[PDB]
């Protein structure tokens, strides 16, 4: 019998955005071919099954550096870490083999299938 | 709100 | 020019509160009437106002525990607390009125206006 | 996915 407010999950979305954004209880550094991104576990978690993977381990969890496959582009990694806190995707004709890559590695499901339609109506 |  | 995936914010908070469920990342409890509730310091500052305020200071932000005012209903704040990881509110005639007293203490804007308009239609 |  609960009632349901309609845009909560996209106000907790942009509040945890306006955190990110002024580097608010940020709580790891994910370093991507020297590029430096400040995030929270938690968002990232929610958002990629690796991120759950690692901070559900018992050593990793504890971790405040988590550094990210050579081969992962930083470009691409920015656009995902936006999304993830944006639902935006910035998705390019330039862009879009390093985002599924990246979403690939991060096992963002949703991201990839996207990239894999894109990709599929140019061909 | 809504009736979800 | 980007692209945006309607459920992602749905999504994201339905993981946070997997989290929850689990106490995973939890990383304060708050504390009401000897009653103890885990949770997340960035979602209940993306819920309330009064969170928001507690977990920028420079001191507080450091707090493990958090004891909320002794006038506080742990009924209202558990109701409350589900509210914030899932947008659903559990509002019934025998808890409106501590819901709506607990939601003004916190600064939850839109439960309080919720509260105001099913008081409101019941005189 | 849509355009926002
Ligand atoms: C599976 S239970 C669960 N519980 C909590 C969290 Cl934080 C979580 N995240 C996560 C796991 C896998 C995947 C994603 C997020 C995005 C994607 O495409 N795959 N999962
Ligand atoms: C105002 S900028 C901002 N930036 C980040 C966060 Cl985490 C935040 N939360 C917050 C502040 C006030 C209120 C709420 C959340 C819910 C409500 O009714 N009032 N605000
Ligand atoms: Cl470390
Ligand atoms: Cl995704
Ligand atoms: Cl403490
Ligand atoms: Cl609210």
């Known amino acids: ?123 | 709100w809504v009736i979800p």
Chains 1, 3 share one sequence.
């Open chain 1, 1 to 123: 019998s609960c009632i349901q407010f309609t845009r909560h999950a996209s106000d907790v979305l942009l509040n945890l955005n306006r955190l990110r954004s002024r580097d608010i209880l940020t709580d790891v550094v994910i370093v991507v071919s020297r590029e430096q991104f400040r995030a929270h576990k938690t968002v990232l978690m929610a958002c990629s099954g690796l991120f759950y993977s690692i901070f559900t381990d018992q050593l990793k969890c504890n971790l405040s550096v988590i550094n990210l496959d050579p081969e992962i582009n930083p470009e691409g990694f920015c656009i995902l870490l936006d999304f993830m806190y944006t639902s935006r995707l910035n998705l390019r004709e330039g862009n879009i083999m390093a985002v599924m890559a990246t979403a690939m590695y991060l096992q963002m499901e949703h991201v990839v299938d996207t990239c894999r339609k894109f990709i599929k109506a140019s061909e």
